[PDB]
């Protein structure tokens, strides 16, 4: 008696072995293949995060429980999960295109980012769209943002509630939050994307949440092009609030990602954990959802709210 669906399950992407990075970058880099410097330079980052095999299982593993736990939850409809990467295959197009292939006629869309945005977001579900129109009689619904879903907000407010419930005294005391997310060419602002919005507004609700009243907001793992990007960036955000008020500690939540990839493990991780040591403070980072039940829940939520159900 159930109703069958697709779920479309859409992600940055991130490659299987040490071997597709370069294909990978390329994609990133718009056709022009890395350098063997560069190139050689990023294996050497992934073999410091610990490996590369690890995060593209993570985005998997996201998909199947999501899937999984929406029939439980709910018998109304039963539904089967399709993965849509941006960057590495299966791509969003060949994601589309097998579904169609599978008899789904109904689908719904859930990117792996919180906030909206017209060159990610709206883009992964425009492009799917057009998959699906191109071959026709498949439908998809598209989730556009969802960082303001109180199970999500909550996820965050708890694990910063616990960070600093660990702190020594002067620590808890004199620390700063900050809240990230991936940063965008800021030409974004010519069509009124909320982007930068959500991410304060996320941002509002996990310090609201914590009863944390000093917090910050910054971008990172920021593209190289001539225009600019959205600023400031959490190394110098984190050295600026650092040389006008000496916070001993800062405890970071990337909460535009939603899985341990190089953005978290690097450029959080080392990078802000090579400035927190440079000017002597504390370095915390509460563990990202992955395919933790609590987030796996939070998602359910966001679709079965966009569905009505
Ligand atoms: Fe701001
Ligand atoms: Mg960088």
Redesign the pocket.
Same mark, same amino acid.
């Given at each position: 008696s159930r109703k069958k669906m697709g779920l479309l399950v859409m992600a940055y992407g991130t490659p299987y072995k040490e071997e597709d990075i370069e294909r990978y970058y390329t994609h990133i880099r718009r056709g022009r293949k890395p350098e063997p410097e560069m190139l050689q330079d990023l294996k050497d980052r992934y073999e410091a995060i610990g490996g590369i095999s690890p995060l593209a299982q993570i985005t998997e593993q996201q998909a199947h429980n999501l899937e999984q736990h929406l029939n439980e939850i709910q018998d109304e409809i039963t539904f089967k999960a399709y993965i849509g990467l941006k960057h590495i295959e299966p791509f969003i197009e060949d994601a589309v295109a097998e579904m169609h292939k599978d008899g789904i006629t109904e689908a719904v869309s859930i990117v792996l980012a919180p906030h909206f945005s017209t060159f990610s977001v709206q883009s992964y579900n425009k492009r799917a769209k057009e998959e699906a129109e191109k071959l026709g009689g498949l439908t998809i619904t598209s989730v556009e943002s969802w960082y303001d879903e109180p199970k999500f907000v909550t996820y965050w407010v708890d694990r910063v509630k616990e960070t600093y419930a660990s702190m020594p005294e002067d620590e808890r005391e004199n620390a700063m939050l900050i809240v990230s997310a991936a940063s965008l060419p800021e030409k974004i602002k010519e069509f009124g994307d909320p982007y930068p919005d959500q991410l304060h507004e996320s941002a509002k609700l996990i310090a609201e949440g914590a009863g944390v009243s000093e917090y910050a907001v910054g971008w990172?793992? &920021?593209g190289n092009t001539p225009d600019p990007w959205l600023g400031p960036?959490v190394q110098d955000l984190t050295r600026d609030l650092f040389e006008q008020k000496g916070y001993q500690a800062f405890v970071y939540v990337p909460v535009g990602f939603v899985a341990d990839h190089l953005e978290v493990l690097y450029?959080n991780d080392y &990078?802000c954990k090579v400035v927190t040591d440079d000017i002597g403070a504390s370095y915390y980072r509460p563990e990202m959802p992955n395919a933790k039940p609590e987030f796996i829940d939070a998602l359910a939520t966001v679709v079965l709210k966009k569905l009505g159900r």
């Open positions: 990172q793992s &920021e960036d450029d &990078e």
